[PDB]
Design a binder for this molecule. Structure first.
Ligand SMILES: *[B@@]1([O])O[C]([O])C2=C1[C]=[C][C]=[C]2
Ligand SMILES: *[B@@]1([O])O[C]([O])C2=C1[C]=[C][C]=[C]2
Ligand SMILES: *[B@@]1([O])O[C]([O])C2=C1[C]=[C][C]=[C]2
Ligand SMILES: *[B@@]1([O])O[C]([O])C2=C1[C]=[C][C]=[C]2
Ligand SMILES: [Mg+2]
Ligand SMILES: [Mg+2]
Ligand SMILES: [Mg+2]
Ligand SMILES: [Mg+2]
Lengths: 357, 358, 357, 357
């Protein structure tokens, strides 16, 4: 019926209103690959990828462009497409940039499929649209900016914020949390994120002090692939350890959950394998008893969380707002899925040319 | 005197193979390689190459490496510190896959350059005597007739073992190939077999128990490479050793596989394991877990690396880059012999490389 | 190309400015074996061994001298030499004094290889020299001397000290830590060392009390070979248990890490097997996620920690300062590797004669 | 109160009628340290140590001579003396040559204590003398000599022999076992010993072939300290894996038995820690359900096995026959304890002089 007829990618470097400072360096702009998936039915699927660093941006575009011949003239059947890519790349390594590229095609193909059936992605997945609580995602901003941004988020109606920590001293971590807490009050979430910057003993010492201060979760305290080390950290805490943005495919999530690395999970729509990977991830989170949040890609994560049995929070970090129309809205701090077929992404074509690499 | 990296040059080539590498999951008909030149303030140039597996990833890998150049040019030629830096710089994007392979290619060129700085073969720089290492001639999913011809030819060349790739539609076809080779080479000869991830766990148990009755030397990647639990289940049903490791991206994946008991043999890939720096760490693990450790591809550097490996087992002879690298590595009586050259011993065939440029 | 041509050893008993009092007895002098490895390239490798007690000093020298014929005329290839000694001693027992002797040969051979290549050992290992934070290592000194020494170390720039505890009463342990803490303030490390003197229940009781006071780590609470007992102790603590100075070879480290005996490790350059053993130990500590410190042998440990992914602290205990030129220096508490080939050891040939046994 | 009044040691290098060829090299002579423990009761305890290689011989004697100051004038209480040595050596490392030296003192002290009470050692331990089945211990002798020695062993009355294997080819291992089996018949033991020479997959392969041939046990297939690896080999076999000659102290035995490394044990009276360590090893083998044999030191092992609840075999390898009187006899292949106080060791004083080092 519906065949894939073309793939077009555009690499952009988009500035951010606030740089994403982390304990391991600053992401000052967002390197994105914008994807269009043309089909024989007249509709075009849209998705985008986040390359994290300009150093990988051109590499990821080139890879996608060389993948185009693998998918042109195949049926628009994302689950069957994913299994084909999984096999074709099983020698090179179906991980990293390659898996990220495969997820970008998956997310565009699902967008295309909802458009074919003139229906929002959440409904094509068999679920009712529902609002999801969102937290406003901040960075390693220093006490002054961290507190201003938390006040502005609370004014916009958000009920929780995330700040990135891992300053040179534990006292600086605690100063930021304490200052946010005094400005937003007790009935407010403060999630904190170390971006893999602590070894396991440091993470136990810092995390127990944060837990005494009162935080909502402690995210990626150590090396993201060290599932055992996260389990050891989690074993010393009442507060939940959060991880998942760096799981490449549901199989990595299965490994982490099988050994108890974390009491929360937050897969990333790209790295987990797109919609197809998210659905599988969501089935694991349910059976392991893990409340499941999103990481980035807030446009598509609104739909996916609505179909997730243990949906927890949506991360509001609008990486692509400069090139995507704001059809996703926030009422009372909850993300509200737009009444649009597919994901609801509409390119801001006038702005894209400003940021092309 | 301090030695600095002063340039990084890459060349993407798509190189002929006398025999296409047929596998159960598809055919590698040419070798897409990225050749790496690491210029230094000592004047010497470090050489290495990467294998992209599919032409689909070739240009992307070269592009990534060219964009990584800015991270390493004007840094000290200290491969262990360079590796720590790349690990940190890529911890958000994902220090795995193509990025990790790119980092390993830098690492292998940097260690080559450091051996050249000290005018000494890499094995001796690593603190070990050069020793010959037994090598098996590595074949593919060749069908009975060609599989048998290549095994006879390898036996005449002095090899004492061959590897064939299996996973034909029927187990009887796998068996027909292994049996035909055995009849042509005799009883005092290794036959390693390679499934390239093509079986589920119950099929792998069934096929491997039948192959075990034929006395093959090991059974390589029976199922999905990341499925360490499943490999353990397959190994639990076998006396023959399960072999894996060519797809471990970094020694951290090796550590996870060995921790669960996935395999009684290991064969890291000098590229995917993370280069010389990653190989040294992999060898330390294999030693403590009691795992005989073989190589995967990259025979030029693997001869050096195995000589430094306490549990060194076999060298895979698959000469992917022979069309563009001078044959300074030799084989005597089936054993790889390290050349008396500084660093790794790689000398480009500069007049051949231009024939294959992408 | 380069062969070992000779081995010379000298047994000394050297005075210590401060006796090393421990919970299990006093090391009042340092019995050392000083090692010279001659090569066909004109350079001489240097190392030394610490015998812990004069009772073992002459035995260790004799053993090394009887090992000379095994290594003379072998290539200067420390990794292959270690394999040869491992095999040759596999029936006698490649542990204990024999293993310590093998490590002494290894450290001198690596010094000699760096000298053949005219490069500091850290650079021959492929790493940049970097300063390494050091703690000043004290002993079971009693409240008065313990505090004085802690004050003096703080004045010299050290950011942490180690004291040895295990007085008859736990109150005496706590009185020393409290006194040191008042003199150095809260932004200062206090590591404490029991030297195997407690059983597991006593160690749980004392360690929880020291944890409440605030210490940096608790080292060797019980019998060094009792990895399961250390695991039980560590399971009851937030503060990290530290061990490793008694691991004979990385295979013993592997056993202890595999069962979770400690959250920190500190291998001893001699007992772990010299440079070759150290390299293997550091690969394990990295995969197990263990910050790795040194025990004694500060001259060579400065190089080794600079090549160690999880390098933590250097122990500053200058056992050999009376016979080795102070080319290793300390700036702001950090050990600074000297710009010398190999390890940087230069014998004080006038002083050695004063201490020969 | 009987006190120790002297400690005398003599290093000898004694001839072997048949060199002990092994897969890892040849022990052509026996380097022994002969021990005399004089007491204030006038009786003298006798024991001896085996240094395995002449390279360790003078070092072991030197260490014993320097330990003498720790034990002279102490009461003749072997269990209290062992505890003192354990503590005094806890920093240097109570293993290796130091532990072997401590065991030699322990074995002389117990022989001394038997003499004080004019009673054989077995009776002082509270057990009846009973004959213990012995196997004649051979080496890596090749097909011709291995079979000749097996014939001669059978004619002397032994009902089992041990041969050492680990020839370059598995077919050579099997050719030896097959020729011995033809010469001795089916109702006869053939123990085989690899002396650590195989990796784990090679050991699985050779052992399953030997198991098909029919052998009594498979001894030290891989590295002696690799307890996990021995467990993996044992998991693939019906035939029992045998080890223990290299355990230094019952604490190492405990670690191996705890993980299931072997279904048989054979501690070495020296390395296990003398009579004191043997008694503790016997208590462990009993609870773990492990039949327990001896390694070497046949003179004292005859007494110790008589007191061992799970006593299995005595290794007959008469390393010291050139310097000790043949008071131990063999009836029907069973070792028969002599009716003599203590261990029953009487030096051949006119012979020791020929072999002094
Ligand atoms: B951090 O992990 O939280 C944000 O989503 C983010 C982070 C790092 C880099 C970019 C974005
Ligand atoms: B196979 O795994 O063995 C060879 O090394 C090879 C394989 C697949 C693809 C290329 C080479
Ligand atoms: B103790 O463990 O710390 C010191 O390094 C030391 C110790 C005991 C004996 C000598 C030195
Ligand atoms: B072997 O393990 O059996 C014998 O007791 C023996 C061995 C090795 C070295 C000496 C004696
Ligand atoms: Mg995060
Ligand atoms: Mg393979
Ligand atoms: Mg200590
Ligand atoms: Mg034996």
């Amino acid at each position: 019926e519906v065949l894939i007829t073309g793939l077009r990618t555009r690499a952009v470097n988009v500035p951010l209103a606030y740089p994403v400072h982390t304990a391991v360096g600053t992401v000052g702009t967002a390197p994105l690959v914008l994807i269009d998936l043309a089909t024989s039915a007249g509709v075009v699927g849209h998705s985008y990828l986040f390359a994290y660093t300009p150093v990988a941006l051109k590499s990821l575009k080139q890879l996608l462009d060389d993948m185009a011949a693998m998918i042109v003239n195949e049926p628009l059947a994302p689950v069957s497409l994913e299994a084909m890519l999984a096999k074709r790349f099983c020698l090179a390594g179906y991980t990293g940039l390659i898996r990220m590229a495969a997820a970008g095609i998956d997310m565009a193909a699902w967008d295309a499929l909802g458009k074919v059936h003139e229906t929002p992605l959440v409904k094509l997945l068999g679920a009712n649209a529902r609002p999801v609580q969102a937290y406003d995602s901040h960075s390693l901003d220093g006490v002054k900016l961290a507190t201003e941004r938390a006040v502005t988020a609370a004014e916009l109606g958000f009920r929780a914020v995330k700040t990135k920590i891992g300053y040179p001293a534990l006292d600086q971590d605690l100063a930021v949390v304490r200052s946010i807490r005094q400005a937003v009050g007790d009935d407010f979430g403060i999630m904190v994120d170390y971006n893999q910057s602590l070894d396991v003993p440091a993470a136990i010492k810092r995390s127990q002090a944060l837990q005494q201060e009162g935080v909502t979760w402690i995210e990626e305290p150590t090396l993201q692939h060290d599932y055992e080390g996260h389990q050891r950290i989690q074993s010393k805490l009442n507060v939940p350890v959060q991880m998942g943005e760096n799981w490449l495919g549901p199989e990595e999530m299965f490994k982490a959950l099988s050994i108890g690395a974390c009491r929360l999970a937050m897969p990333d729509a790209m790295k987990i394998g797109g919609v197809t990977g998210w659905i599988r991830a969501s089935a694991l989170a349910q059976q392991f008893g893990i409340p499941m949040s999103s990481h980035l890609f807030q446009e598509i994560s609104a739909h996916l969380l609505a179909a997730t049995p243990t949906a927890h929070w949506l991360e509001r970090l609008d990486l692509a707002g400069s090139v995507i129309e704001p059809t996703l809205t926030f009422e009372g701090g909850n993300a509200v899925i737009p009444d649009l077929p597919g994901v609801g992404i509409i390119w801001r074509e006038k702005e894209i040319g400003k940021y092309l690499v």
